[PDB]
Tab-separated table of C-alpha atoms and ligand atoms in Angstrom:
chain	number	residue	atom	x	y	z
G	1	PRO	CA	9.055	0.907	13.851
G	2	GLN	CA	12.654	0.462	14.285
G	3	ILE	CA	14.678	2.140	11.512
G	4	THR	CA	18.383	1.522	11.041
G	5	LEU	CA	20.588	4.071	9.446
G	6	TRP	CA	22.308	2.267	6.507
G	7	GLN	CA	19.864	3.959	4.330
G	8	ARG	CA	18.179	7.376	4.537
G	9	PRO	CA	15.256	7.244	6.943
G	10	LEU	CA	12.639	8.257	4.474
G	11	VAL	CA	9.034	7.946	5.501
G	12	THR	CA	5.629	8.466	4.008
G	13	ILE	CA	3.576	11.374	5.195
G	14	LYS	CA	0.137	12.520	4.057
G	15	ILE	CA	-0.074	16.482	4.439
G	16	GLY	CA	-2.428	18.899	2.958
G	17	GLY	CA	-4.312	16.040	1.354
G	18	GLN	CA	-1.133	15.213	-0.438
G	19	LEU	CA	1.086	12.242	-0.111
G	20	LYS	CA	4.989	13.139	0.321
G	21	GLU	CA	8.165	11.107	1.401
G	22	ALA	CA	10.315	12.763	4.204
G	23	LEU	CA	13.563	12.321	5.895
G	24	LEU	CA	13.474	11.839	9.778
G	25	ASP	CA	16.014	14.350	10.864
G	26	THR	CA	17.113	14.427	14.525
G	27	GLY	CA	19.711	17.123	13.147
G	28	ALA	CA	16.872	19.720	12.456
G	29	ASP	CA	15.178	21.413	15.226
G	30	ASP	CA	12.379	22.403	12.756
G	31	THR	CA	10.175	20.426	10.153
G	32	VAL	CA	10.833	22.127	6.656
G	33	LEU	CA	9.181	20.873	3.618
G	34	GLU	CA	9.529	21.757	-0.179
G	35	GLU	CA	7.042	24.043	-1.959
G	36	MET	CA	3.586	22.606	-1.833
G	37	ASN	CA	0.089	23.730	-2.219
G	38	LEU	CA	-1.195	24.495	1.370
G	39	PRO	CA	-4.153	25.995	3.160
G	40	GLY	CA	-4.031	28.774	5.728
G	41	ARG	CA	-2.405	32.153	6.351
G	42	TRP	CA	1.471	32.046	6.770
G	43	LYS	CA	4.282	34.100	8.202
G	44	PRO	CA	7.840	34.914	6.687
G	45	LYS	CA	10.783	33.299	8.578
G	46	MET	CA	14.348	32.202	7.722
G	47	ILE	CA	16.233	29.047	8.866
G	48	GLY	CA	19.866	28.057	8.756
G	49	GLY	CA	21.701	24.822	7.958
G	50	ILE	CA	25.126	24.358	6.221
G	51	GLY	CA	26.090	26.591	3.281
G	52	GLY	CA	23.487	29.245	4.414
G	53	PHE	CA	19.870	30.541	5.210
G	54	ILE	CA	16.659	30.016	3.496
G	55	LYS	CA	13.566	32.149	3.795
G	56	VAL	CA	10.659	29.826	4.626
G	57	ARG	CA	6.946	30.618	5.319
G	58	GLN	CA	5.594	29.491	8.751
G	59	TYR	CA	2.356	27.465	8.938
G	60	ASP	CA	1.429	26.908	12.602
G	61	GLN	CA	-1.019	24.228	13.313
G	62	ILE	CA	-0.770	21.711	10.484
G	63	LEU	CA	-1.882	18.066	10.649
G	64	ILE	CA	0.524	15.382	9.305
G	65	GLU	CA	-0.137	11.781	9.249
G	66	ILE	CA	3.600	10.685	9.683
G	67	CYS	CA	4.271	7.025	9.156
G	68	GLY	CA	0.474	6.560	9.617
G	69	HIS	CA	0.761	8.220	12.967
G	70	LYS	CA	-0.476	11.930	13.512
G	71	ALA	CA	0.715	15.048	15.137
G	72	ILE	CA	-0.116	18.826	14.567
G	73	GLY	CA	2.552	21.587	14.621
G	74	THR	CA	4.610	24.011	12.649
G	75	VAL	CA	5.444	23.035	9.001
G	76	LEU	CA	7.750	25.752	7.344
G	77	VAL	CA	7.734	25.823	3.638
G	78	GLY	CA	10.773	26.913	1.435
G	79	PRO	CA	13.899	26.119	-0.810
G	80	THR	CA	14.830	22.657	0.828
G	81	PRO	CA	16.426	19.624	-1.134
G	82	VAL	CA	14.437	17.153	0.998
G	83	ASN	CA	11.307	17.244	3.390
G	84	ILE	CA	12.626	17.216	6.884
G	85	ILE	CA	10.531	15.957	9.762
G	86	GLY	CA	12.367	17.748	12.439
G	87	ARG	CA	12.217	17.511	16.174
G	88	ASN	CA	9.060	19.314	16.719
G	89	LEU	CA	6.903	16.481	15.468
G	90	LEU	CA	9.458	13.557	16.241
G	91	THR	CA	8.791	14.060	19.819
G	92	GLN	CA	5.004	14.089	19.256
G	93	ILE	CA	4.959	10.670	17.374
G	94	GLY	CA	7.174	9.558	20.241
G	95	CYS	CA	10.335	8.731	18.221
G	96	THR	CA	13.733	8.422	20.155
G	97	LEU	CA	17.323	7.602	19.322
G	98	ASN	CA	18.651	4.272	20.797
G	99	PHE	CA	22.196	2.649	20.887
M	18	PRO	CA	21.380	4.516	25.545
M	19	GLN	CA	17.810	5.713	24.993
M	20	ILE	CA	17.789	9.462	23.773
M	21	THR	CA	14.542	11.422	23.549
M	22	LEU	CA	14.171	14.195	21.070
M	23	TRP	CA	12.891	16.888	23.498
M	24	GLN	CA	16.314	18.529	23.700
M	25	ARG	CA	18.953	18.900	20.943
M	26	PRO	CA	20.796	15.393	20.997
M	27	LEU	CA	24.303	16.538	21.500
M	28	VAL	CA	26.823	14.058	22.930
M	29	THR	CA	30.574	13.763	23.647
M	30	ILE	CA	33.152	12.553	21.327
M	31	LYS	CA	36.926	12.205	21.471
M	32	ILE	CA	38.491	12.981	18.020
M	33	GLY	CA	42.439	13.479	17.873
M	34	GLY	CA	43.418	13.845	21.552
M	35	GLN	CA	40.635	16.597	21.733
M	36	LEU	CA	37.195	16.417	23.399
M	37	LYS	CA	33.918	17.887	21.675
M	38	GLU	CA	30.184	18.000	21.676
M	39	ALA	CA	28.297	16.709	18.481
M	40	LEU	CA	24.714	16.666	17.258
M	41	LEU	CA	23.827	13.002	16.512
M	42	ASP	CA	22.127	13.465	13.275
M	43	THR	CA	20.106	11.122	11.115
M	44	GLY	CA	19.781	13.613	8.279
M	45	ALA	CA	23.433	13.692	7.523
M	46	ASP	CA	25.008	10.832	5.524
M	47	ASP	CA	28.264	12.378	6.677
M	48	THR	CA	30.205	13.371	9.766
M	49	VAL	CA	31.108	17.067	9.326
M	50	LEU	CA	33.021	18.531	12.095
M	51	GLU	CA	34.170	22.101	12.474
M	52	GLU	CA	37.771	23.069	11.961
M	53	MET	CA	40.424	21.683	14.291
M	54	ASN	CA	44.045	20.378	13.870
M	55	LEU	CA	43.683	16.935	12.404
M	56	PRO	CA	46.841	15.212	11.202
M	57	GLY	CA	47.010	13.669	7.724
M	58	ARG	CA	46.779	13.995	3.902
M	59	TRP	CA	43.244	15.247	3.048
M	60	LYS	CA	41.094	15.210	-0.124
M	61	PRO	CA	38.682	18.227	-0.836
M	62	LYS	CA	34.975	17.536	-1.164
M	63	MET	CA	31.832	19.497	-0.892
M	64	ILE	CA	28.396	18.665	0.757
M	65	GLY	CA	25.036	20.206	0.548
M	66	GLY	CA	22.953	21.142	3.585
M	67	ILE	CA	19.745	23.349	3.405
M	68	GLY	CA	21.367	26.699	2.572
M	69	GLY	CA	24.319	25.665	0.545
M	70	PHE	CA	27.451	23.655	-0.244
M	71	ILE	CA	30.580	23.883	2.023
M	72	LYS	CA	34.110	23.149	0.854
M	73	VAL	CA	35.598	20.574	3.383
M	74	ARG	CA	38.552	18.377	3.649
M	75	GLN	CA	38.216	14.733	3.774
M	76	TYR	CA	40.046	12.778	6.410
M	77	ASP	CA	39.469	9.056	6.029
M	78	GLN	CA	40.347	6.330	8.659
M	79	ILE	CA	40.091	8.537	11.774
M	80	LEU	CA	39.076	7.016	15.247
M	81	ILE	CA	36.470	8.633	17.354
M	82	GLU	CA	34.901	7.588	20.686
M	83	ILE	CA	31.371	8.723	20.403
M	84	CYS	CA	29.608	7.883	23.785
M	85	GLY	CA	32.526	5.405	24.969
M	86	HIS	CA	32.131	3.602	21.656
M	87	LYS	CA	35.198	3.969	19.479
M	88	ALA	CA	34.569	3.532	15.710
M	89	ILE	CA	36.790	4.386	12.621
M	90	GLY	CA	35.522	6.500	9.832
M	91	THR	CA	35.777	9.324	7.309
M	92	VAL	CA	35.520	12.706	8.789
M	93	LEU	CA	35.027	16.051	7.098
M	94	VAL	CA	36.607	19.187	8.578
M	95	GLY	CA	35.269	22.428	7.448
M	96	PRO	CA	32.848	25.400	7.975
M	97	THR	CA	29.940	23.913	10.084
M	98	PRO	CA	28.229	25.692	13.038
M	99	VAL	CA	27.904	22.313	14.985
M	100	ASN	CA	29.796	19.053	14.897
M	101	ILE	CA	27.649	16.530	13.234
M	102	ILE	CA	27.789	12.857	13.535
M	103	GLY	CA	26.113	11.383	10.411
M	104	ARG	CA	24.873	8.024	9.545
M	105	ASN	CA	28.394	6.919	8.303
M	106	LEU	CA	29.300	6.434	12.051
M	107	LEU	CA	25.740	6.197	13.431
M	108	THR	CA	25.457	2.762	11.845
M	109	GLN	CA	28.844	1.854	13.483
M	110	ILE	CA	28.081	2.717	16.950
M	111	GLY	CA	24.675	0.717	16.644
M	112	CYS	CA	22.202	3.783	16.592
M	113	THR	CA	18.605	3.170	15.447
M	114	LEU	CA	15.575	5.440	15.140
M	115	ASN	CA	12.587	4.211	16.962
M	116	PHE	CA	8.652	4.641	17.564
H	211	LIG	C1	25.323	17.936	7.717
H	211	LIG	C2	25.166	18.013	6.186
H	211	LIG	C3	26.492	17.308	5.693
H	211	LIG	C4	23.907	17.223	5.765
H	211	LIG	N1	23.798	16.908	4.274
H	211	LIG	C5	23.745	15.772	3.831
H	211	LIG	O1	23.686	14.758	4.384
H	211	LIG	O2	23.643	15.903	2.345
H	211	LIG	C6	24.204	14.855	1.391
H	211	LIG	C7	25.413	15.261	0.294
H	211	LIG	C8	26.484	14.505	0.222
H	211	LIG	C9	27.356	14.756	-0.769
H	211	LIG	C10	27.233	15.699	-1.693
H	211	LIG	C11	26.092	16.486	-1.603
H	211	LIG	C12	25.180	16.291	-0.688
H	211	LIG	C13	22.708	17.941	6.191
H	211	LIG	O3	22.746	19.260	5.897
H	211	LIG	N2	21.792	17.359	6.928
H	211	LIG	C14	20.504	18.052	7.385
H	211	LIG	C15	19.320	17.392	6.687
H	211	LIG	C16	19.467	17.672	5.194
H	211	LIG	C17	19.930	16.654	4.450
H	211	LIG	C18	20.282	16.881	3.074
H	211	LIG	C19	20.104	18.150	2.624
H	211	LIG	C20	19.622	19.199	3.415
H	211	LIG	C21	19.266	18.875	4.755
H	211	LIG	C22	20.382	18.322	8.945
H	211	LIG	O4	21.009	17.150	9.423
H	211	LIG	C23	21.114	19.530	9.407
H	211	LIG	C24	22.144	19.339	10.575
H	211	LIG	C25	22.480	20.557	11.296
H	211	LIG	C26	21.656	20.829	12.458
H	211	LIG	C27	21.831	22.003	13.079
H	211	LIG	C28	22.481	23.009	12.545
H	211	LIG	C29	23.275	22.855	11.395
H	211	LIG	C30	23.285	21.644	10.736
H	211	LIG	N3	20.036	20.527	9.874
H	211	LIG	C31	19.614	21.585	9.244
H	211	LIG	O5	20.404	22.095	8.168
H	211	LIG	C32	18.384	22.203	9.749
H	211	LIG	N4	18.884	23.285	10.716
H	211	LIG	C33	18.488	23.233	11.856
H	211	LIG	O6	17.380	22.788	12.402
H	211	LIG	O7	19.270	24.177	12.765
H	211	LIG	C34	18.768	25.007	13.705
H	211	LIG	C35	19.627	26.367	13.703
H	211	LIG	C36	19.638	27.177	12.625
H	211	LIG	C37	20.451	28.244	12.461
H	211	LIG	C38	21.376	28.412	13.459
H	211	LIG	C39	21.424	27.576	14.674
H	211	LIG	C40	20.406	26.434	14.640
H	211	LIG	C41	17.425	22.577	8.673
H	211	LIG	C42	16.707	21.365	8.271
H	211	LIG	C43	16.452	23.768	9.293
């Protein structure tokens, strides 16, 4: 799908048997999503954006059905305003920037 | 251009007689550039990112050449670790997310 940027590139993701909406962020190196009930064993981790640094939990090996397309990777959970599909899954679904 | 997301999508800009590298970012509705000498009246404003809210100075009607493509926009100068080109100019240079 070709998404233009007049409006926030929000997508539909099915993760953890839960449906969520998420920004497609080429600016984040990492996928970070808001608090959500999720299976597994996690690790502490912190990430930084503008303003500061949040303490996330890292879940390695998670399946997301992004835009009705799948990938498996690292989903970090923590204090975000929006769910961010970062570059480590974007490459997996084969997304690119074009101009 | 076709940009794959495997590396961090930095690119060259020319803002105010100066030459810089900027993250092309779909997750920002705004171009926030680090501090530099920009000449003009500026408003304050404040934006949110993952960790907080930065106090930044609005410059409106500034010309940038992002990849050879000039475009006029509003540009925020303030405390960021990276220059970000947001959707307010990404629309303008014709950029499109894709998969
Ligand atoms: C650049 C900001 C103006 C932009 N915020 C934004 O557009 O908010 C709207 C707003 C407008 C008016 C009033 C209030 C709010 C933003 O933070 N956008 C995010 C995605 C987002 C959108 C809304 C809220 C929160 C997040 C993302 O682009 C940044 C860019 C960026 C990239 C690299 C470094 C710094 C900034 N990456 C991030 O913040 C990611 N960091 C990242 O991946 O960086 C790696 C790294 C970390 C630390 C040190 C070096 C490198 C996080 C998602 C983890």
